[PDB]
Amino acid sequence: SHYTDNRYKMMECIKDAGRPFYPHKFKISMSLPAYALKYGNVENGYIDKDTTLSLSGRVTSIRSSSSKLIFYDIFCEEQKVQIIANIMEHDISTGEFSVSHSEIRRGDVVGFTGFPGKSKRGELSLFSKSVVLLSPCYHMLPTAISGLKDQEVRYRQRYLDLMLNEESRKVFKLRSRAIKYIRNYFDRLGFLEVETPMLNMIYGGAAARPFITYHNELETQLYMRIAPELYLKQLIVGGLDKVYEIGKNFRNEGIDLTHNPEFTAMEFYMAYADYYDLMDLTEELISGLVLEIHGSLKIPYHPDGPEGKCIEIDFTTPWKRFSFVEEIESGLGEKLKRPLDSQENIDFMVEMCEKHEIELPHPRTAAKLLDKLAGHFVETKCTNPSFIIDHPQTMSPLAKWHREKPEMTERFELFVLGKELCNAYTELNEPLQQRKFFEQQADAKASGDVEACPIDETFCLALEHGLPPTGGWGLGIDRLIMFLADKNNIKEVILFPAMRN
Template structure:
C-alpha cells in the first residue's frame, strides 16, 4: 500500500495475478477512506470501480466502493523475505503458498500431472476403480501397516500398504484393464523421499507382462511431461538457480539386468560370491547394520545404496532375485530371478513392474515363505480368487509423488505434498491481537 494523504494506491492479488487499486478520499468519503487507509496486509477485499491506466502504464481500478470480506488478525510473512524457515513452510503451507508463488505453481503442476496420467490411461481403455483403504490383512507389499479398530465389526483393520491384491481380484472377475490412483500408508521412516502417506498409480493389464508395462511406462511418462511442461528434457537446478543436470525422457530407455549393474558397479561375478564375502564387500562400501542379512538382502542393500543413486537417466532394471518380489512370475531364462523391472530415474525408483504371478500353487508357496510362521498374515481370500483363474497379466506401480518430484525438480517429497507428515509441536502460537470493532 502507498499512502499519499488524500489518496492511496494498493495491490489486490488472487490466485491468477495482482491488480492495482486506487482509493480517493473525495470519492469514498472521510469515514470509508479512513478505514481503507488503516487496512492491514492480508485483509481480503471486494472492490467496485472503473478501470483506467496510469501514466506508467499500469492497469488500475479506481474504487467507487469496497467491502472488507475478511479481516487478517495475523500478519502474513514479511514482504521481501517471505517464510524462510523450511519446516514452517511445511507446517503452515497456507503461508508458504501466500509468500512463494513457485510453491503454488508446483502444486498446480501436480494436479495437471495427475489429470494427464488419467487421460493417458482412459484413452487406452483402462478403467479407473476404487479398492478398500481399510483391509483385514495388510497385503501387496512388505511394509509395516498402521492399525485401527472397527467397533461395530469388533476387529482390527489395517490402512492399506498397497491395493495390489484387490486389483488382481478384479482381473479374476473379468476387468482386463484397471488402474487406481490411490493413497497408501506405511508406518515406517520419514525422509526426503518417504512420507508415511503417499500416492501411487497402480495399473494392471490382462494378457500383458512386464514387457507390456515397460512399453506403457516408456510412453506414459514422456506423454505426461510433454503435455504439462512442453518438453522431454527436464532441468534440475541447484539452490543458486544454475542448471545442475538435465534428465532426458525421450524414448527408447536403456534396459539392464540387476545382475549386470551390480557386476559393473561392484565386481564381476558379485552375485555368485558367498554371503560372507558379500557382507565384507558391502561393509567396505560403507553399508552398516547388515549382520544377519540373507544373501539376496545384502545384494539388494548394495544395489539400493551404491548402484541406484548413479542411475540418473531413465533405465529399466530387470530380473531381480525372486526372493525380493514374491508376487511376480519366475523368469524362464533364469529361475533364480523373476520377470520384473524397476524404472529408475534421477537415482530413484519411480515404478516397479511385474509379470504377475497367476499360478495359485506357486503363489501360495512364495507367500508362505514370506510370512514364515505368521500364517495369519496370509491372504487366503486372494489365494482362493487365484484358484478361480487369473489371466496372465502385467502390473505396475508408479510413485506419483516421486514422478512430480522428477518433473518439477523438487528435491524433497515434502515439497510436492501439500501437508506432509510432521511431528506435532508442543508449543502453541502466541495469542492474537483482536482489533477494534470498526476494523
C-alpha cells in the first residue's frame, strides 16, 4: 500500500525538520471520561477561555468546514470528545496552522491543548490552540469491524477489534468482573489462593493429551499441566484445608467453538466436603454470579448468532440431576451389562453404538464407550444448567466410590446447553485403589488412548500420608464467560485465541 510508505516518508521529514517526533511524555489534564463528567452538562455554546486543558485520544473523524476551521473526533477510555481547531486560536509557536494539521490523519494518536466547553450545536468539545502527533497510524482503518477484509482479522489483530468494537471491549471487562466475583466468593469462605506448577514431570488430573517440552539445564523432559489437581490435593494433605487456583491449563488437542489449546480454569479443594456439598456450592456461586451480572436468573443465549433465534437459560436452583447410567439406559430402552468394564458390556456398548449410529471411539475402552453414550443420550438433554452425576469408576480414576451405588463414583459434571462447565467429585483418598486405577489408566494409554494419564507415584505417596475426606472441583472460566456474555465462539472471550496458520 502506497499509504504506509508515504506515512513513513512523512515521519522522516518531520524528524529531519526538527518537528515533534514521537514525544516521550504528554501530560493530560484529565481523562476523556472525566472531561465528559465535568463539562458534559454545560449550556450550548459554553466556553471557558480561562481554563487551558490537555486531552489525548485516537482520531476517529476529521471534517474541515473551511481553510480556517477543522473538526476532529477523538476517542479514549470509552469516551468520544469533539475538537474544534480554529486558526484564530492556533499557537503559532507550534508551527503554521496548516502545517500542524496536515500531519494529522484518521487513526492517529494525538494530543490537543485548549479551552473546554460545548459547540452551539450542543456537542461536547475542546476549542483547541494546538495539536501534537503522538503516535501516527500507518494504515488506513475502517470506521467499524464490518469494513475489515474478513472477520478473522478481529482475532489475528485483536487491537483492531478493540479499537473499533465496543462489544468486544465489553466482553473482557465482564470477564474481569466475573473473576473478581468468583475470587471474592471463596475469599469470604476463608480459602487460600495458591499456584501449583504448570511444568510437570508427570501430567495428570484430566482426560487430555499434553504438550511436551524439555528443561535443558536439568536434562529432563516436562509436560505442561492438563490440570493442577494432583498438586492441589497434596496441599490438603498438608493441612491448608481450603485452597483454590485460577490459571491456565494446556491441552494439546484440536480447536473449535469450545476448545482452545490453553484456557483459564479454576480448581478448588475443600476438606470435609463431599460432592453433595459441592453441588450446593456450585448452584450458589453460579446463580449468584448470573444474578450479579444479569439482575435475573433467566438469561438470553443466541446459539446461531445475534440476529438468529434466542433461547432462555434458566439458572433457578436447584438444578436438574441426571444419573449417568440410568439416563443412558432410558435412551437405550435396556440395561447395560455388569460389570460395566466387563468384556460383555464393552461388546454390548459397541453393539448399541452401531445401532444408534454413534461414532465409535478408539481405543474401545469401557470408559470411552460410556462417554460416547452419555454424549448422545444425556448431554443433549442439558439445556438449562444440569448435573450429570454418579459416573462409573472405570471412567473416573480419581473419584471416590459411591457410598450407595456399586461401580459408580461420587462425581458430577455441570452442563449448560450440552457443554461441560464443571467437573467435581468426592476425592478418592484410598491409595490402594488409587494405585490400581492409575495402572488401568496407564494400560489404556499403552493401548493408544492419548487422553489417558501415566502412573504418578509421587501422588500415591502423598495419599499414603493421609488425605482428609475432601471435595474437589473445577470450572472452565472461559465457557462460563461465553454464557454470561452470550457468545457462541470461544474466540470471542479470549484476547488472543489460537488460529490455523
